[PDB]
Amino acid sequence: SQGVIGIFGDYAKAHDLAVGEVSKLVKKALSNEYPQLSFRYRDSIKKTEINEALKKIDPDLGGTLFVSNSSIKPDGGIVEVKDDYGEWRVVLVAEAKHQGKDIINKRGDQDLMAAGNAIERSHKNISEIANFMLSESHFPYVLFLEGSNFLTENISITRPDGRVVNLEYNSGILNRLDRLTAANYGMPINSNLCINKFVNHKDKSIMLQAASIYTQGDGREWDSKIMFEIMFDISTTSLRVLGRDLFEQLTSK
Amino acid sequence: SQGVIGIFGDYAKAHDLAVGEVSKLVKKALSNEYPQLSFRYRDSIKKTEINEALKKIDPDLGGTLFVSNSSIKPDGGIVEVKDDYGEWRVVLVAEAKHQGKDIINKRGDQDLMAAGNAIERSHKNISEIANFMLSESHFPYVLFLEGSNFLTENISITRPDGRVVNLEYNSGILNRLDRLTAANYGMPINSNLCINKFVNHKDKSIMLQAASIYTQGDGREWDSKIMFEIMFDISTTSLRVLGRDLFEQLTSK
C-alpha cells in the first residue's frame, strides 16, 4: 500500500521540486487518494474574494478595495476541495522563505550581509488568508523557513581557509525566527497546527488561527521529499475538518 | 472648559511633534484629565511579556523565545493605565508610516521611485500587540499612513517646468493602501475602531481585533494638532472599556 504517495514524494526530491511545484503534486495526490471529490490548484486570490467572503460573515466587514486587480499570491499556490454545496474550500496554502545566505557553498554593491527583516512581510500574506477563511474551522497555512537567520540549534561551519565559523543560533545579529512567531501564538515551531484551537476568555470562546511555521534550523536546505508529506499532513487534516461538509460526496456508495 | 486639551493640541502642531512625541503629550493629557489613575508611557515590549501574557491565557500558547532581548517597538510608544488590581493595561499604541515620496517639495543610487511594499512589515508590529492584548476587549492600535502611495482621492500636482502631473489614486503602480487593509477586516479606513467587534459564526462568537488605519489620502502630510485628538479619541475609548476594572480608583470620593 505505500505506493502512489511514495512515488510522488520520490519524484519531488528527484527534481528538487519548488515549494509551488510541490503543492501541484500535492493536489495530484490529494485527488488520487480521495477520488470522489474535485480538487483544484490555483495561485492567487483576487482581493475581491476576500471581501465577498467577509461581507458574508458580516456586512460591516470587507468593504474596501482601492486597486481592483489587487490579490494575495502565496508562493506555493493553493489547493481546494469542492464541498457538498458546490463551493470551494481551502485545503493547503504553502509559502517558503529563504532569508539567510551567510553559510552555503562595510556594505558592498549590496548591503552588509548580517541580518535583515524581510520576513516581517508576511503582514499581508497571512492576515489576508486567515481573513478569507474567517468562517472555516481550520487554517492550513504552512510556512517553510530556510536560511542562516532561522537556526534552531547552533552549528559551526568550516571555511575556505581553515576557519570553522561557530554560529550560535541565538545570536542577535543572526536570528530572525522570532519575527515570525507571533503568527502562531507562541506555539510549537515545526508542528501541524492545522486545526483551530478555541481559547476562551471571560465567557468567551475566541478562535485562534495559527500558521504552522516549519524550519530547518541546522542551516541545511529543505528536502523536497519531506516538503511533500508535511504539506500532505496539513492537507489531510483540512479534509479531516471539512468532513461533515463533504459526507455524501464520499457516500457515492 | 476647552482648555488643557486645547493648549496641548496647539503645542503639538506649533512644533510639528513626532508621532512618538505626540503619545507622550497624550499621556500628559490622559493623566491631567483623569488624575486618579496612574498613567505611564513606555516604548518597547520585551518579547517575554507577550509570552508571559500568552501563557496566562493558555499554557500551550507563548512558549518560544530564541533571542532573549527580542522586543516589539512601536514607532509612537505606548500609554498604559494602572488598573484596580495593580497591573498595567494598554491604552494607546501609535505607529506612523511614510511610504511615498513622489510628490513633496532606470534605478539610480537608489531604486526606481514608483512603488514599494515596505508597509507589509507591519507583520510583526501588530500581530505581536494584538496577541499581547488577547485578553483585553479592545485594540487601541493606531496607524498613520502618509505618502504618495496612500492616496484615497485623486490629486494632480503641478511641476517645476509647468507640467501638472495628474495622479490617479487607484493607479496600480502607485497605491499601496490595500496591503494594510487586512489589518482591519475590510472595515472603514480613518475611523476609531478601538472597541472589539464580536462576530459569531456557527454558534461561536469569535473576537476580531482591528487596527484603526488612518490616512491623509490627498498627499498632504499629517497635521500634528489633529494627530493629538485622534490618538486621544482612541485613548478615551480604551478607558471607556477599562471602566469596570478602574471603578474604585475613580471612586476616591
> Would you say B33 is a known binding-site residue?
no
Which CATH architecture is the domain B1-253 placed in? 3-Layer(aba) Sandwich (3.40)
Residue B124: which of A131, A182, A189 has the nearest Cβ?
A182
Closest-CA residue of chain A to B169: A66
Distance of CA B237 to the CA centre of its chain: 14
Q: How far apart are CA A229 and CA A235, in angstroms?
A: 9
Residues of A in contact with B175 (CB under 8 A): 66-67
Q: Report the residue of B68, B70, B123 to disrupt the A interface, i.e. the one with the largest count of A CBs within 10 Å.
A: B123
Chain B neighbors of A68, CB-CB under 8 A: 170
DSSP string, B206-246: PEE---EEEE-TTSPPP-HHHHHHHHHHHHHHHHHHSSTTT
Structural domain spans, chain A = 1-253
Of A7, A5, A12, the closest CA to residue A223 belongs to A12
A229 vs chain B: nearest CA distance in angstroms?
25
What would the grid cell of residue B58 be? 493558555
Q: For residue A135, which residues of chain B lie inside 8 Å, CB to CB?
A: 201-202
A97 is catalytic: yes
In whole angstroms, what is the distance from residue B87 CA to residue B62 CA?
Answer: 19
Would you give the DSSP letter of residue B36?
T
Burial class (CB in 10 A: 0-12, 13-18, 19+), B129: buried
C-alpha cell at B87: 497591573
Q: Could you give the residue ranges of the DSSP H alpha helices within chain B?
A: 4-13, 19-33, 47-57, 122-132, 224-241, 247-250
Residues of A in contact with B183 (CB under 8 A): 123, 127
Among residues A27, A47, A80, A97, the one annotated as catalytic is A97
Are residues B120 and A121, on separate chains, in Cβ contact within 8 Å? yes
Q: What is the CA radius of gyration of chain A?
A: 20
Q: What share of chain B is helix, strand, coil (3-state, %, to 5)?
A: 35, 15, 50
- Residue A75 among the catalytic residues: yes
Technique used: X-ray
Q: Which residues pair with B89 in a beta bridge?
A: B81
Q: Which of B21, B49, B75, B229 is catalytic?
A: B75
Resolution of the coordinates, Å = 3.0
The set of residues, in sequence order, having a beta carbon less than 8 Å from that of B162 and lying 6+ positions away, is none
| Nearest alpha-carbon partner for B90 in B36, B53, B143 | B53
CA–CA dist A86, B113 (Å, integer): 45
Find all residues with CB under 8 Å of B45, minimum gap 6, and list them. B71, B72, B73, B78, B128, B129, B132
Which residues does B116 contact at the CB level (< 8 Å), separation at least 6? B99, B149, B176
